[PDB]
Ligand binder design. Structure first.
Ligand SMILES: [Zn+2]
Length: 257
């Protein structure tokens, strides 16, 4: 199976997933000086007012907080998007040290972690159909730097003990994702892919310029999770991020100058 180790890490994925060498792969390095300001880009519209979280799960690669996507409760619209995209889950990628962890980089700068809020285009009916379309998913990427604690993240940090190993899940209701958003919604956008297998090129990436800060104690907790399942040798879940891929024939656009 794929993973982030020396023998099953990112450099080996292409063997089982040839598209890993595709023309629209993520993540990428965002060069702030060659990104183009596009004044035709509308402001992002995030409506997480009626969001319904359901469960938190350790999937052996990261931990996901899942949401009820049976209706338009938590949606993303505007920006470079067409149509309504429903939030289905969010997860993180982090490092073993504070100087690495994000997947995207800005001018080669790596952050301590990166949060992905995954949404699917409602015109496709369900998530499974949406991942097969070029405009099927919209992922909001938010960088995390170490500094002051993020109040809204604590609820997530406290439940991690309960889902230490692969396959464990816990009830996680009434969690409000608005507490994880930075103050500004300025962003960069480019067409890309999922960053984990199957690595489908079905994503419109919306990466926020402004990072949120979390404390070292909060990030420390992430590093205590396990890739392994209960009863197997312990492998700490750290460095679950894919390196930047070549931009190729793509232009990164900015919603700000
Ligand atoms: Zn991700």
């Amino acid at each position: 199976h794929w993973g982030y180790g020396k023998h099953n890490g990112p450099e080996h994925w292409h063997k089982d997933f040839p598209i890993a060498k595709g023309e629209r792969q993520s993540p990428v390095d965002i060069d702030t000086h060659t990104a183009k300001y596009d004044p035709s880009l509308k402001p992002l519209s995030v409506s997480y007012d009626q969001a319904t979280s359901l469960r938190i799960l350790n999937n052996g690669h990261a931990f996901n907080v899942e949401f009820d996507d049976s209706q338009d409760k938590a949606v993303l619209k505007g920006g470079p998007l067409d149509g309504t995209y429903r939030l289905i889950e969010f997860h993180f990628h982090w490092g073993s040290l504070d100087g690495q962890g994000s997947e995207h980089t800005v001018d080669k700068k790596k952050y301590a972690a990166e949060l992905h809020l995954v949404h699917w285009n409602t015109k496709y009916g369900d998530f499974g159909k949406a991942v097969q379309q070029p405009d099927g998913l919209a992922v909001l990427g938010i960088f995390l730097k170490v500094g002051s604690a993020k109040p809204g993240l604590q609820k997530v940090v406290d439940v991690l003990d309960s889902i230490k190993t692969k396959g464990k899940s816990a009830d996680f209701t009434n969690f409000d994702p608005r507490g994880l958003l930075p103050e500004s919604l300025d962003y960069w956008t480019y067409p890309g892919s999922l960053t984990t297998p199957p690595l489908l090129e079905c994503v419109t990436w919306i990466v926020l310029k402004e990072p949120i800060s979390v404390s070292s104690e909060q990030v420390l907790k992430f590093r205590k999770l396990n890739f392994n399942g209960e009863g197997e040798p312990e492998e700490l879940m750290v460095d679950n991020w894919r390196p930047a891929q070549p931009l190729k024939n793509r232009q990164i656009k900015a919603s700000f100058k």
